[PDB]
Design a binder for these strands. Sequence first.
RNA 1: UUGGCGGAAAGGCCUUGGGUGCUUGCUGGCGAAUUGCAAUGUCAUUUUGCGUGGGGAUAAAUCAUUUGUAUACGACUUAGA
RNA 2: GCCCUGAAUGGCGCUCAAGCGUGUUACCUAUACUCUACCGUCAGGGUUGAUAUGAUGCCCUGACGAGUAGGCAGG
RNA 3: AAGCUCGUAUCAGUUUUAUUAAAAUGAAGAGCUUUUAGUGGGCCAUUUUUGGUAAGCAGAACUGGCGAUGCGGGAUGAACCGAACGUAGAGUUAAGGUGCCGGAAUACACGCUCAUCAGACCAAAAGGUGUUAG
RNA 4: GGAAUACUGCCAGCUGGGACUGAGGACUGCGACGUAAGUCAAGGAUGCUGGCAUAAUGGUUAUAUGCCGCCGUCUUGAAA
Lengths: 197, 144, 170, 68, 106
Amino acid sequence: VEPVVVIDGKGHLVGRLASVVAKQLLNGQKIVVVRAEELNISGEFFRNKLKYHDFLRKATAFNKTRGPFHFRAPSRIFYKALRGMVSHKTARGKAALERLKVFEGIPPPYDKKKRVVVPQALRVLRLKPGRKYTTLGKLSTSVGWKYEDVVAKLEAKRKVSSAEYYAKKRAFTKKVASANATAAESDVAKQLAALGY
Amino acid sequence: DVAALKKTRKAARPQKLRASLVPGTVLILLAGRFRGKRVVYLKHLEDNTLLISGPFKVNGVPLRRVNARYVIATSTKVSVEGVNVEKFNVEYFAKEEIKAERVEDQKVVDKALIAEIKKTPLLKQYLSASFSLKNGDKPHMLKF
Amino acid sequence: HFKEYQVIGRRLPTESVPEPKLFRMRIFASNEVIAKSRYWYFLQKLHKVKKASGEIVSINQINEAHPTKVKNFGVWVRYDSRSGTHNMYKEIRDVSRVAAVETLYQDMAARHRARFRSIHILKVAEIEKTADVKRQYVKQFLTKDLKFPLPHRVQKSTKTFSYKRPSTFY
Amino acid sequence: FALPRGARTATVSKKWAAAAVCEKWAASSWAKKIAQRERRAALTDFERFQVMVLRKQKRYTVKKALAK
Amino acid sequence: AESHRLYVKGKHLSYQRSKRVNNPNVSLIKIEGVATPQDAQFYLGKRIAYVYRASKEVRGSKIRVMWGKVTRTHGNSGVVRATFRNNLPAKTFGASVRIFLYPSNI
RNA sequence: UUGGCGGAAAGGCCUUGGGUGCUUGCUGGCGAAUUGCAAUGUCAUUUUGCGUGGGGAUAAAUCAUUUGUAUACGACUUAGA
RNA sequence: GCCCUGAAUGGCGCUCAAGCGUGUUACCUAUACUCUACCGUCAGGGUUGAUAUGAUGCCCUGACGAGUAGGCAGG
RNA sequence: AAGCUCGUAUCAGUUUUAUUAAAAUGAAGAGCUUUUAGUGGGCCAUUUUUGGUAAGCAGAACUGGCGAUGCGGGAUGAACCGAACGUAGAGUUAAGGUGCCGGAAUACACGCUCAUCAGACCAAAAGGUGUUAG
RNA sequence: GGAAUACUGCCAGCUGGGACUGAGGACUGCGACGUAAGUCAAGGAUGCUGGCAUAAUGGUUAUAUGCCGCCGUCUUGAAA
């Protein structure tokens, strides 16, 4: 329905978000993920942090370079989870992965475009109340990520100047509502209500 | 030597037209030269095709034969009782530049049909607008 | 959805002993066929008469008289497990006996891993008077003007995407 | 609306009618939205076309009012 | 009008298949707006056309079309089985397809 | 054409001014055809060449000589009209 | 009933589970099964005051069809 | 493989009295010679079961799967689950599954667990101010 | 005190939509409708049409896409 879907990873589960996005990728739908650094994983910090180290151990017994290497960026962590859910090493899998983009925060021009969320992957709607959860930001920093401060610092600048845009939009909508409200009850407006509009 | 065919047991019984297809019903063409154009149903022909008119003066659709399966029948019915359509038949469309007789019949049928259309407001405008789907539309939900 | 059946067997009669005791019991089952099998199984555990010499005199469904009144049900259950069968008593608040007994099987399977074949329902009786209920979790619902919310409600989304960032409020 | 615990069908109907919940229910946005969605489904193609004409006419007046 | 589309657009998911073996003779088509098999019942029997562009002009046109029909519903998520005169090349998984409204019965 | 904002991948986003088309906001005058009962019935996207017409700038590296802060052999670092 | 010590899931992955125990509905499939098209084997039956295809021929009906050593028949 | 006799009171890897009649089901595939290629490995599981000391299990025999064997599932896998195969079109299923790879419901209902490699894969009798129902 | 409604089972009840098959090749027969003449959905598809007269669908092959997947003999319980 949307040529390019932008998904906000904040408050989502990596496994649920990755699985949902993975199927869409195989279906030809292009998807972009933003604010990956704010993505969350179930369980308290120790379990998530401990499991990441265990995976790092089995990289390669003899030579890490002649094998896999560990990406510290939160986006790569999500990409690794999504990569395992796609038939990599194949033309269909490789082509599907090319339709996916992941960035920390909301780099432009996506900042000026609407972003959606997946209702069936939100932590609020999936995790039991009162249970502990882990955030990729702390996990990524604990494993050597050196850009958490930069992302947080410039993300506030993203948060700023957006409320101003909404503030102008909110005032503009107020004028539209007043213009629409006064125009209501007219002959055309009254007839429209009959047809449900 | 040649062998004759066995005596087949089949009857070409008249087509059982669907209930939604009634004369004077506003049709929508799904394919062909006038695909998407809104049309008025006039008469059922002998060859199972439907005799239809735009009318021609309104949207330029002339008297044509159209298949019932390539048409969506709406619930908007315009009076067609006053229009005589007995002249048109299968032989009328036997082709092989516009024939003079075709133009004369088109205007005669249009004259009676135009007056009926003029009754309901916006009906003339409605028939002059080609139907097309829009984002979020769902034919199975859209009532017709 | 089980059904309540009444099954009577009378150890098919022999000369000089007409009309035997006609043992009577009530069995809950999904269908008549299942009810008949359970009746034979229970007999062999209590009455040494076997299915070969037994007979089913009649079987009729017992529908709840008033499937609108909310009734507190006291149930005594005997169930088998890794250890010998243990006597058990539970209280269930439900509209009808058939509905109440159904929840017991789910609870037994969850909290005791017991199943239908290993559970023997001894008796189901209504708690006709209040303050006779012993379990705390049943007295919980008897308080006057009992009002409680349903916090953190979740709406099952139909589409795969949502632009509203839905709230769980109720 | 007020109702005694365990009220029978007759009692519920009596209290239901007295409270006029149906009248109050309809006079709300939540109930109105349900009717609006149902109304939009029954709109015939001819009726749908009329909405476009009416909507455009309203747009002209609404936009004409603005910018002044 | 800006829009002239008279067909319902959909995406070809994949062929009917088991875990290992696949059946190219049957294709699975996803129709936009369909959520349950009951809604998909309307689309049964509708003509399915796949449109792709070829550099070499054939018969005066560079556009080539493959025709098919909607056969039966598939799964519980509105998926519908599809068949064509010639099966799809298997390179169009996720590609858009055109589902026409004819033959109509409304 | 005035002015402003956007450096995260800004490569875009907004406003003063007048110019020129449409305006289905409303009412009118003509053409649609023979694509013959449908054939996606051809209406976009990235790249390139040959052509004109109007603009702009109009150089370097290697080999060679030579050299050692280098050099197993390659390779690499110096200097020149 | 479930959890840690009581010694050292296929992957992606998951926690009101996408784990555990039970029940209630929808669906994917095997060369399996139900209907139909074709090749051959068997079995049954028609066949002449014979039809040019010639009775080793022209037909109608039902079932069957895996396979090593080995045997038979047709090419 | 031929012949003979006989289409069937000819029997059956089938169900019950009796001290082998007969009653049900299935079938024309029943009987006598005459002669004639290949065949002597067995493995796994079940059962009667004797023997025994750290152990395991060994061993006598019986009944099934393989041994000559494709197909779907078991992520791959002797001997596991269903299913005994001419070439094709249509539909329903066996076992397995329905978050992606992977075709199918991020279905419903009731409970259950925070595990610092949980859970989905016998040394455990007991310990734990862990949890839940008796 | 009387009505339904739910569940089960029946209809040699009605009514649509979708998917594959069109096998046989002059009548012989079993049936239905009609007073009859005759007709029929009754021992297997018939009735019209639109483009191909630029004559192609299609046949062989290079590549690509979705899935599947070293030989001849001989051991043992298969693999070895």
